[PDB]
Design a protein around this ligand. Structure first.
Ligand SMILES: *[C@@H]1O[C@H](CO)[C@@H](O)[C@H](O)[C@H]1NC(C)=O
Ligand SMILES: *[C@@H]1O[C@H](CO)[C@@H](O)[C@H](O)[C@H]1NC(C)=O
Ligand SMILES: *[C@@H]1O[C@H](CO)[C@@H](O)[C@H](O)[C@H]1NC(C)=O
Lengths: 294, 49, 98
């Protein structure tokens, strides 16, 4: 069923600046307390990224946001939740059961990487009933499965096992690059406990490499798949009766840039500085240090 | 006097190569040890990856 | 009747598919040996490495961008590598006419 559910709230995009996120281990080499300058793809510091949300505080049956997005060179996805509303992704060029599409679906038993093509609905997603026998009774992700030649299965990426509704102790950050016919996915799941629900956390992190795929197809457009826990918070009908929960996720972008990174004694990344933001940052990059004298 | 004249080194004698096991393999038994075989016109076309 | 199968492998090598290295070999330590850990061939002397990699790290690197430690693909232990010993020779003489 292509649902095409009503009460479609089309709103302008909320903007949140990119506060010193978007760093990842560029390769598999190891270092020890050194300074390194690297020219590669990164998310530039302090850039306005798009904020999307699905929340039932005021509109339990009216707040859904699953539009298509362009995948120019890579994205930095981030999500803050506690009940795992975000569950899948979709990519490709035409998405008309004619071009290969990547259905990264988390599942529960095992994450599945699929290259196959499908005729997806106008508003594809998944929903699962509030019943005790929890199961995605609505396989509304698509309706046709035509042709493909590669599939892959692995252990599903872990959850924080914090299934509450208070301060969202689930925060998951992902980066998806596609170069040289390799689809590389870096990620990190930062649990934390409490944080003011204003924007993305103000701090620093790192993005360990997770997976690589040698599939090698051109990519130009994508979007996200939300599996809903359709409950009796608005009891009765299903297609129109559901809850929007409380979920927020931010979408950024990548640009070629030069960075200076430092390593600790055991080789982890503690902090880094770009080479195009401020004249002082340019001076740090050129002098190759974190301190300068008069 | 003294004369810096020669350079010496120690050369190896043997080689070693390593690889991360053979854990995954291509299942080809089902081809030869097939329960039943395909007809003359039309055929099974098995893609290996 | 004869049961026959025809194998047809494609080309153009953009979708690298099957391949195989196979043929693993033995290990030695504390001797001048050539090593081909993962196609990063080198020559030198092996030993242990007390330093700990990250779980995804494969082979280390030191100042001046040189290989210094590699994790063995079989036993998953990070060994340390040192270049072969070498040096220079000086000759002391008191005089040919003496
Ligand atoms: C989810 O896991 C089950 C358990 O093996 C599996 O049968 C099912 O195919 C998986 N889902 C998808 C979409 O593959
Ligand atoms: C680095 O890691 C080692 C163990 O891997 C630990 O003993 C040490 O305290 C760590 N140091 C820092 C600065 O993280
Ligand atoms: C390789 O296989 C042997 C077989 O016993 C096993 O002991 C070893 O841990 C394996 N190593 C890897 C990296 O799979």
């Amino acid at each position: 069923q292509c649902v095409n559910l009503t009460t479609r709230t089309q709103l302008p995009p909320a903007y949140t600046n990119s506060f010193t996120r978007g760093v990842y281990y560029p390769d598999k080499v190891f270092r020890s307390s050194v300074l390194h300058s690297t020219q590669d793809l990164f998310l530039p510091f302090f850039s306005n990224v798009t904020w999307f949300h699905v929340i039932s505080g005021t509109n339990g049956t009216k707040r859904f946001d699953n539009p298509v997005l362009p995948f120019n060179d890579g994205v930095y996805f981030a999500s803050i939740e506690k009940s795992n509303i975000i569950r899948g992704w979709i990519f490709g060029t035409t998405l008309d059961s004619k071009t290969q599409s990547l259905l990264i679906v988390n599942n529960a038993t095992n994450v599945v990487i699929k290259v196959c093509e499908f005729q997806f609905c106008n508003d594809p997603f998944l929903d699962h009933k509030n019943n005790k026998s929890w199961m995605e009774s609505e396989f509304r992700v698509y309706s046709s499965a035509n042709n493909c030649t590669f599939e892959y299965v692995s252990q599903p990426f872990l959850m924080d096992l914090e299934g509450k509704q208070g301060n969202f102790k689930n925060l998951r950050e992902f980066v998806f690059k596609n170069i040289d016919g390799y689809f590389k996915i870096y990620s990190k799941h930062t649990p934390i406990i409490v944080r003011e629900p204003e924007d993305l956390p103000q701090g620093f992190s790192a993005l360990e490499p997770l997976v690589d795929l040698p599939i090698g197809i051109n990519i130009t457009r994508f979007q996200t798949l939300l599996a809903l826990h359709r409950s009796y918070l608005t009891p009765g009908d299903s297609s129109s009766g559901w809850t929007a929960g409380a979920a927020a996720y931010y979408v950024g972008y990548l640009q070629p840039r030069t960075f200076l990174l430092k390593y600790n004694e055991n080789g982890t990344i503690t902090d880094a500085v770009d080479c195009a933001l401020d004249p002082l940052s340019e001076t740090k990059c050129t002098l190759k240090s974190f301190t300068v004298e008069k | 006097g003294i004369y810096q004249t020669s350079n010496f080194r120690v050369q190896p004698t043997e080689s070693i190569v390593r690889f991360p096991n053979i854990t995954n393999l291509c299942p080809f038994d089902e081809v030869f040890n097939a329960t039943r075989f395909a007809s003359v016109y039309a055929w099974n076309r098995k893609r290996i990856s | 009747p004869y049961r026959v199968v025809v194998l047809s492998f494609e080309l153009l090598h953009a979708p690298a598919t099957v391949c195989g290295p196979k043929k693993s070999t033995n290990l030695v330590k504390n001797k001048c040996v050539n090593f081909n850990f993962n196609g990063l061939k080198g020559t030198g002397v092996l030993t242990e490495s007390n330093k700990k990699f990250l779980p995804f790290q494969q082979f280390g690197r030191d100042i001046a961008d040189t290989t210094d430690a590699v994790r063995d693909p079989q036993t998953l232990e990070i060994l340390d590598i040192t270049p072969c010993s070498f040096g220079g020779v000086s000759v002391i003489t008191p005089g040919t006419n003496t």
